[PDB]
């Protein structure tokens, strides 16, 4: 299995510039941090659950918070990207757990947020006062607001008295019954119409 039957030597890519590109990326990150100081270098990201059954056991960072999440957290959608909150309008909240977790995340960020006034001589009501403007700050929201518990806890201790009785008939038999019912859902409903029609005809 050697795919060398084309003119492969004309598009061979080497990577001698790997440390130089790392140096260039680090210089760009330092310049971005110096330009964005005292704001963090990145935006706040929500916690979302990965698709498919292979990866639905793990959570990660998403693109941006939903409009419903921002509305529940009390942050207007025009203010949100101006104070370092990423906003996604395509994502929806199909369940209450992820919505509540992201609302709590937004509330923690808003509680830890320091908002400087646009004009220093005229502070506003929603603006952080100068005597609380000084504190120890963070510049990495991916570090200070990462995914703390990506997977579920793999070990838990319970007392011997509260051991559940489990599914009657066994877990293996329950799985087999579920598969059999899923395969036979249509035929049983068809013979249900057939029995109903026979009863209506010969009532």
């Amino acid at each position: 299995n050697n795919h060398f039957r084309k003119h492969w030597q004309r598009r061979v890519r080497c990577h001698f510039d790997q440390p130089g590109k790392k140096v260039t990326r680090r210089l760009a990150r330092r310049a971005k941090a110096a330009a964005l100081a005292p704001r963090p270098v990145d935006k706040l990201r929500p916690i979302v659950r990965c698709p498919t059954v292979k990866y639905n056991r793990r959570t990660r960072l998403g693109r941006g918070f939903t409009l419903e999440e921002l509305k529940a957290a009390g942050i207007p959608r025009l203010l949100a990207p101006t104070i370092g909150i990423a906003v996604d309008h395509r994502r929806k909240n199909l369940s209450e757990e992820s919505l509540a977790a992201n609302v709590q995340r937004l509330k923690d960020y808003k509680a830890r947020l320091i908002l400087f006034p646009r004009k220093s001589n005229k502070p506003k009501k929603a603006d952080t006062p100068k005597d609380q403007q000084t504190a120890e700050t963070t510049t990495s929201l991916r570090t200070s607001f990462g995914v703390e518990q990506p997977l579920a806890p793999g070990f838990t201790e319970i007392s011997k008295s509260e051991i559940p009785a489990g599914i009657e008939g066994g877990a293996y038999r329950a799985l087999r019954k579920a598969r059999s019912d899923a395969r036979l859902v249509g035929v049983r409903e068809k013979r249900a119409k057939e029995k109903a029609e026979a009863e209506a005809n010969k009532k």
Partner: protein, 108 residues
């Protein structure tokens, strides 16, 4: 290295069905036997259970957190009750767990 080659020494002398759009994530389901089930418990806690200092506590093991979807039944288990949460289980695995004194719960 060129000096170690033999050429320097030889100088001077020369079926079934087709599946369109297969997605492996549908069929992702790694399996673990019951004789490696106690290895998922942390080592100190596992040694306490195996010594017998915990006679009133039963460990709950989530296979999906460790990366397993099915519990298979190769090996034997000690007489310690264990709670196992798994997507799939085999008949012999559940039988051996119930002989050990625990229960296999089904999750998704």
């Amino acid at each position: 290295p060129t000096r170690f080659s033999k050429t320097r020494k030889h100088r001077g002398h020369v079926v079934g069905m087709r599946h369109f759009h297969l997605l492996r994530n549908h069929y992702w389901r790694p399996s673990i036997n019951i004789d490696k089930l106690w290895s998922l418990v942390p080592s100190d806690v596992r040694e306490q259970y195996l010594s017998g200092q915990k006679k009133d506590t039963a460990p709950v093991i989530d296979l999906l957190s460790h990366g397993y979807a099915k519990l298979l039944g190769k090996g034997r288990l000690p007489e310690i009750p264990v709670v196992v949460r798994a997507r799939y289980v085999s008949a012999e695995a559940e039988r051996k767990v119930k002989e050990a004194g625990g229960v296999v719960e089904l999750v998704a």
